[PDB]
Design a protein around this ligand. Structure first.
Ligand SMILES: Nc1nc2c(ncn2[C@@H]2O[C@H](COP(=O)(O)OP(=O)(O)OP(=O)(O)O)C[C@H]2O)c(=O)[nH]1
Ligand SMILES: Nc1nc2c(ncn2[C@@H]2O[C@H](COP(=O)(O)OP(=O)(O)OP(=O)(O)O)C[C@H]2O)c(=O)[nH]1
Ligand SMILES: Nc1ncnc2c1ncn2[C@@H]1O[C@H](COP(=O)(O)OP(=O)(O)O)[C@@H](O)[C@H]1O
Ligand SMILES: Nc1ncnc2c1ncn2[C@@H]1O[C@H](COP(=O)(O)OP(=O)(O)O)[C@@H](O)[C@H]1O
Ligand SMILES: [Mg+2]
Ligand SMILES: [Mg+2]
Ligand SMILES: [Mg+2]
Ligand SMILES: [Mg+2]
Lengths: 347, 7, 371, 371, 347, 188, 7, 7
């Protein structure tokens, strides 16, 4: 009933989740069908509309960072003057520019043109602190570069109904990576957080046999059979450290979305398998529960690492299991901890 | 046996 | 330092670290070697494929299981399996960590002695222990008392334990388990059209029972229903898209646990074997054993294996006993989970056979809790 | 300061404080030690289990009674039993309180001398006394005169006392009591199907007689009735829910008190032994002994042991005597109750062997009222 | 015959006993069957109806006090502003609140909702000094907090047919502990006073082997084998200092009651084993006698400690025996005292 | 028990009929250790005990250590998990149950009979153990004739031949008149 | 056969 | 196994 979406939209909006609820209900319908809990790393309020519009998404190989601000918000710049701004890690400012240039030459195609719908630019100004001077088609923009910098942005309308964009002085074009099959620029993917099948099903067949089980490389001395590129070389180059269950799920979670046939939202391995995961970077997540939770509802927003721990313990007690990434230090299954503390208390 | 053991 | 816990069952290596709630590595104990001539100069040079690396890449390989009925039958392939466990799956230098291995009760002393020889002399493991798998299933069940029907790929064994004292004279063991059920379903399917016959086809029939098969609650009535009706005929899709329709043998496969005569085996079923293992116990403990029939290991995962077990033991037990079957969802890994418990206990850190002790005392030291 | 009263019978420790009307602690004199290999690192480390802590936890243990026929046969286990009596059951520092122990008449001097050595040197007891149990049964009966058929787990003994003078030459003692009746019923039950055979199964047969067994008022007519009819066949339910049907041996067990030849024992029964103990007395007291056959201790609890006793003594006594059997409900504890009386009397506070006196006089002092 | 219940109801009501006679006859039928005297610590007139309605009961682990007043009468508050009122022991007012909070987190579940039936609230007003202003469904209450305080209580009717409750200012909810299996709030249990089997049967098997025989901890100096938590740790954590006879009896006394299958009235050890017993707190008790007494009738109300002594001496003379709690100083068995005084009078 | 101890070596005898192979393995190979802890020390030291047997299909089974651990179960019933005195303690405890005046003659006449007394060294082990229990002046004599295997039957042939016995038969007429109680004539 | 092989 | 069964 529409009230379910109505409430869930406010649960999302208060928590600053950027998943469109019209997708959250389709993903939960897949969680229910596959009897799997899974999670999505944060999707920002910024991106919401781009996902609704039906742009391609960042996919796996695309190295780039992606902006929360300006008209380029929710896109990936490759004219990364953001590089001096987006995180301001000084080594990142030059070196992430050049590594993105390496990625830019390979799998990504490039578009030297933003194509903002005015209604999209209006929503931007209405929400995300763009400053807009408009004579209708004659639009230009102003923004804050989150080191603290201020800019002029020379938009131009086109017969497209979509504005091109550029920054001050560079007033012609901006280059936002664009999927090599489509013509449209890629936005942020739904980066899976974890996949946690019902533990009766966990490890059936090979389904959860992650391609690198111990995820992060460390050398084992003289007897080590795998070099670092021998270790990472058995990641799947398109999906990363995928598992057959994760792969089947990121098929089903694209087939259910009614998504455009080259416009998929999920591309790659769950973050429990990503050797570059950071835990305090995953939140707020959304997790999809096949059944009644037990503070959440069955598309549950996880706000912070302690709320994630409470979710993990509720998942693992309902019988869903996921093999955590080494750096996570999640809580142990309740029926485990209640045995471990039964024996640690000398019996 | 009837109780105590198997036979 | 975390210990490894390394439940090398007949079917799957389950390996991980002590004090973690499930294995990291779970992959079959298979070593495949290519049965066909390599022609592409480059990749066919890999002599053999281990575990999940060889359950895929499957139809090119003769798949050999190193462990059969819980006994390691091939040692060069078990050193391959363990080499891959430590250095490719867990990525741990075993020189660094104690290793809690496990084995079935009532099996050759040569297996503990060779496992320990290999751990101390190939992998240089600093200290190690070799726990009985059905004791571990009680540590995983968080209780000191119960009769553990640990049923695996290789072996089904009951170890009755009461207040932490195992009763070794009451330990039953059947060499009847998920692999004899695989090889049985692989025959019963040829009553329908389907001739699964090679290894690798063994893995299709394995997945056919790990999916479709269930235990009949009243076998003769399920037989009557399946002869009457198509209502049981679930179907499965083979790796090449052929649809296999199964139906009647969907439940006749795991019935072999309760009627071993199907696989031609002179034995009591697992219900009679559990009950007979309780009757071997002192009468004063049987109430608590009847109230704690822990189940563990994978072939206890069939839908309705509890409840069928409960119905059958309750038919055997003397009508006033609370026959309770404890079949948690995680029972599939309970041996490993219980090994993670055990290897975490502070009272246990004295029990490791250190390599110094193995060198001084010789291989007799490994039989510390023999069964 | 209240004294302890500590009737360590062969069967149950009964311990408490003087001037209290029943024991606080009543638990069997058993020390069990585990007969099986501990595997759960944590609780199997307890070396041995004492009293009621070991009658439960039972089937895992070989249950040893420290006292047999009223004689302490194992002293390390009796120090365990007393350590648990003072510090786990009564929770009293024995350094603080005098201790009225008891023992049977006509038993080794080494038992008083070792009990007193242990009380003075392990438990440091400040003062102690060692009363004869059948004297205590008269203090519990509130009378100075009577022949006390105190019958326990270990011993049946008559002590005739008249006007407060015991007649030691008339004291009978049989090593025939509830434990020889347990071990007899444990055999007679194997005439039916039931093979109770271990210790711990001894405790099931003990509970079978402490429940089902009764004394036939006319044994040959109860035998004729039970052979004629099922009307005697009470049934009992073993610790595992098996139903045991008993019937005929329901009364043949305690008949062993009146026909010791059943347990193969060359003796007069307890009726002949009581009468023969009255005939050992001076003829001038026999009227008052016949009118005061106090009964005490547990095996006098069988239904119809009085009345059977009265019928049999009245068949022996010379037809004008008022044969009266005094069998109060509390007779089960009468030895302890009488010890609580005795240890409460102001005239008694001089009778304690103080530790100073034991140190000066040596262990001969303990035999103050020897019998 | 109904006159037996008719008379027994007036025996109860004059003495202010709150046991429903329809239960007293079922418990006496169990006393008769098991040939056991047993006692129940006071059940107040306040609670009567809650026990009739079939609420869960306080059980063992639930630390809370429980009220005699207001609509919360006969329930356990955990919004314990009662804490400044219920006993007015100043250290209890804060510290019993916080200790109840510890208990509240563990075994008890909580309900932030009273659910008074209007007929129940009417009986309350008719008896226990609630002050009620009613427009039918629009009910609110007024009461005395027995330090002397007065309150307004904002009830609200619900489709439940049951009123929620709150106090002045806090006019939404009140939290009365609720058993964790059921949804309903727990009321006062029938706390066993003593169990006194026929002394031929007393101590048969292990039946009366109380888990801590000397009940209250005192240290024995250097040679003591048990620490305080080593001593109390062999109490049964669910039943307390239970004995196998007490356990079997609190099975039979639940099976006879026809009680709901998670709705049991008796949970725990008899007060002769409770290390926190207080004698002047147990009265008026009800004791159930297998046979004709000898002022009582065979479900006998004990009004005060001297009437308890007279009962204990009549029990012990009929041959029932119970091992008293150390702090009780009960009379000694008649056939004992008549021997002890036979010898104390030098013979 | 031997059917289990053999699985410490490779051999899994497990069905009935395999029970009859292990039966024949002990009726052939097994012997009683005269000093069990020294035979254990010797068999751990040396292969000198490892007799071998040939299964019904020509597989050769090598046994050795459990060759004597099987019948040790008679003297240490705890091996088969059984709470009991061994047969030496049980024989001695059965003599102590007797009147002291007969124990000299019982100690001088420990007849052995029936098949499991056929193990090599079950006498002598019995004698050593009873002599350790008996009070150092008693002539502990174990009578273990070669025919002991059938001594129960041979003694039944004696008994049924005695003229004094021909009155002891329960005739069918007596069984019909007295009913089944008559059969317990010498009950034990 | 129906699966597994040609016949 | 070495005898009795295949392993
Ligand atoms: N699953 C997986 N992902 C990998 C791996 N190596 C690199 N990645 C990539 O790292 C990326 C994690 O950081 P970001 O690129 O900032 O994620 P995002 O969702 O775009 O966040 P933001 O908009 O703030 O830039 C996502 C993933 O495509 C791998 O081995 N496995
Ligand atoms: N039998 C027993 N009870 C214990 C023990 N420790 C705590 N208790 C608890 O103490 C409680 C005694 O005081 P209350 O909680 O006021 O009893 P009540 O019947 O609820 O009385 P009121 O309504 O006036 O609060 C009952 C019992 O659950 C123990 O070791 N044994
Ligand atoms: N869910 C399942 N249902 C039925 N059979 C299963 C299931 N999971 C595993 N099995 C079977 O049990 C065996 C795996 O057993 P498991 O105990 O998990 O490993 P191991 O046997 O090595 O200890 C295989 O035969 C597999 O076919
Ligand atoms: N009610 C009873 N009926 C029959 N036998 C009993 C009864 N109570 C105890 N006994 C037996 O008597 C012995 C207990 O004797 P008791 O005198 O109470 O202790 P103790 O023998 O140590 O003094 C045990 O053999 C027990 O089996
Ligand atoms: Mg991504
Ligand atoms: Mg296993
Ligand atoms: Mg006695
Ligand atoms: Mg209570």
């Amino acid at each position: 009933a529409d009230m379910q979406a109505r409430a869930l939209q406010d649960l999302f909006d208060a928590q600053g989740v950027g998943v469109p609820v019209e997708h959250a209900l389709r993903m939960q319908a897949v969680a229910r069908q596959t009897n799997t809990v899974f999670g999505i790393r944060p999707v920002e309020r910024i991106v919401t509309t781009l996902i609704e519009e039906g742009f391609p998404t960042k996919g796996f190989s695309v190295k780039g960072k992606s902006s929360n601000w300006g008209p380029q918000a929710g896109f990936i710049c490759v004219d990364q003057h953001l590089s001096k701004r987006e995180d301001r890690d000084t080594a990142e400012i030059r070196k992430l520019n050049l590594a993105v240039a390496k990625g830019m030459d390979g799998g990504a195609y490039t578009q030297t043109d933003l194509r903002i719908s005015r209604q999209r630019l209006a929503e931007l100004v209405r929400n995300f602190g763009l400053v807009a001077d408009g004579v209708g088609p004659v639009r230009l923009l102003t923004a804050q570069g989150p080191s603290g910098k201020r800019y002029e942005f020379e938009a131009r309308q086109e017969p497209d109904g979509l504005y091109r964009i550029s920054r001050l002085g560079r007033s012609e074009a901006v280059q936002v990576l664009a999927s090599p099959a489509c013509g449209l620029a890629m936005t942020a993917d739904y980066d899976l957080f974890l996949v946690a099948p019902s533990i009766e099903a966990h490890g059936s067949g090979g389904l959860d046999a992650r391609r690198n089980t111990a995820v992060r490389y460390t050398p084992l001395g003289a007897k080590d059979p795998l070099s670092e590129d021998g270790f990472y070389g058995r990641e799947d180059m398109a999906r990363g450290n995928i598992t057959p269950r994760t792969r089947q799920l990121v098929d089903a979670l694209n087939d259910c979305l009614g998504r455009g046939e080259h416009r998929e939202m999920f591309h790659h391995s769950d973050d429990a398998g990503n050797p570059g995961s950071h835990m305090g970077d995953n939140f707020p997540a959304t997790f999809y529960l096949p059944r009644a939770m037990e503070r959440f509802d069955e598309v549950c927003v996880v706000a912070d690492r302690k709320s994630f721990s409470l979710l993990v313990e509720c998942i693992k007690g309902n019988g869903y299991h996921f093999t955590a990434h080494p750096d996570w230090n999640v809580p142990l299954r309740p029926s485990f901890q209640e045995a471990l503390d039964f024996f640690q208390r000398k019996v | 046996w009837x109780a105590x053991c198997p036979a | 330092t975390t210990a490894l816990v390394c439940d090398n069952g007949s079917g799957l290596v389950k390996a991980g670290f002590a004090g973690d709630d499930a294995p990291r590595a779970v992959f079959p104990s298979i070593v495949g070697r290519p049965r066909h001539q390599g022609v592409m100069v480059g990749m066919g040079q890999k002599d053999s494929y281990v575990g999940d690396e060889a359950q895929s890449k499957r139809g090119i390989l003769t798949l050999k299981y190193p462990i059969e009925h819980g006994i390691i039958t091939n040692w060069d392939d078990m050193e391959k399996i363990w080499h891959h466990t430590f250095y490719n799956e867990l990525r741990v230098a075993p020189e660094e960590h104690p290793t809690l291995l496990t084995e079935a009760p009532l099996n050759p002393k040569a297996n503990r002695e060779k496992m320990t020889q290999i751990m101390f002399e190939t992998f240089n493991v600093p200290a190690m222990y070799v726990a009985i798998q059905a004791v571990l299933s009680l540590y995983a069940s968080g209780r000191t008392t119960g009769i553990v029907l640990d049923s695996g790929d290789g072996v089904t064994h009951n170890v009755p334990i009461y207040e932490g004292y195992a009763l070794p004279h009451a330990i039953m063991r059947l060499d009847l388990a998920g692999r004899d059920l695989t090889d049985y379903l692989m025959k019963i399917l040829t009553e329908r059209g389907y001739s699964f016959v090679t290894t690798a086809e063994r893995e299709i029939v394995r997945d056919i029972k790990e999916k479709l098969c269930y235990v009949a609650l009243d076998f003769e009535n399920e037989m009557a229903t399946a002869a009457s009706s198509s209502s049981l005929e679930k179907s499965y899709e083979l790796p090449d898209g052929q649809v296999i329709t199964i139906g009647n043998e969907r439940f006749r496969c795991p019935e072999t646990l309760f009627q071993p005569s199907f696989i031609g085996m002179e034995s009591a079923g697992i219900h009679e074997t559990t009950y007979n293992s309780i009757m071997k116990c002192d009468i004063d403990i049987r109430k608590d054993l009847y109230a704690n029939n822990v189940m563990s290991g994978g072939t206890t995962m069939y839908p309705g294996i509890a409840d069928r077990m409960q119905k059958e033991i309750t038919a055997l037990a003397p009508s006033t006993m609370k026959i309770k079957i404890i079949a948690p969802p995680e029972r599939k890994y309970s041996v490993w989970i219980g090994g993670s418990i055990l290897a975490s206990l502070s009272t246990f850190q004295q029990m490791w056979i250190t390599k110094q002790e193995y060198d001084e005392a010789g291989p007799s030291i490994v039989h510390r809790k023999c069964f």
